[PDB]
C-alpha cells in the first residue's frame, strides 16, 4: 500500500524529466530556426542597403 504511492511519485518524476527534455529540445530548435531566418533577412537587407 506504501510501495504503490512510492512508485507513483517515482514514475511521475521520470515523466517530468522526459517531458522537460522534449520541450526544451522543441523550444531550442524553434529559436535557432528563427535566428537563422533573421540572419538571412539581414543578409538580403545588407545587399540592398545603400550609402558610404
Amino acid at each position: 500500500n506504501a510501495f504503490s504511492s512510492f512508485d507513483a511519485c517515482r514514475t511521475g518524476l521520470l515523466k517530468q524529466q522526459s517531458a522537460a527534455v522534449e520541450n526544451s529540445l522543441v523550444r531550442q530548435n524553434m529559436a535557432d530556426v528563427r535566428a537563422k531566418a533573421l540572419f538571412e533577412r539581414r543578409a538580403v537587407l545588407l545587399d540592398l542597403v545603400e550609402g558610404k
Binding site: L14, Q17, S18, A20, V21, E22, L25
Partner: protein, 63 residues
C-alpha cells in the same frame, strides 16, 4: 588515599585497554555486517557487469 589511588590506577589501566578493544570489536561487527550486505547485493548485478558507458535509464530523446 594513596592505597586507593594505586588500586584505581591499576583498574583504570585495565579498563582503558578493555574499552579500546571493545570499541574496535564493535567497529568490526558493523563492518562485517556491511560486508555481508555487499556480498548479497553483488548477486543482483547482471551477468557481465554494468554497462558503465551508457546511462541506466534513458529518459528523453536526443535529436
Amino acid at each position: 588515599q594513596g592505597i586507593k589511588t594505586v588500586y584505581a590506577s591499576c583498574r583504570y589501566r585495565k579498563l582503558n585497554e578493555r574499552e579500546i578493544i571493545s570499541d574496535r570489536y564493535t567497529w568490526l561487527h558493523e563492518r562485517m555486517l556491511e560486508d555481508e550486505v555487499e556480498r548479497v547485493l553483488l548477486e543482483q548485478v547482471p551477468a557481465g557487469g554494468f554497462d558503465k558507458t551508457r546511462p541506466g535509464l534513458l529518459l528523453g530523446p536526443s535529436t
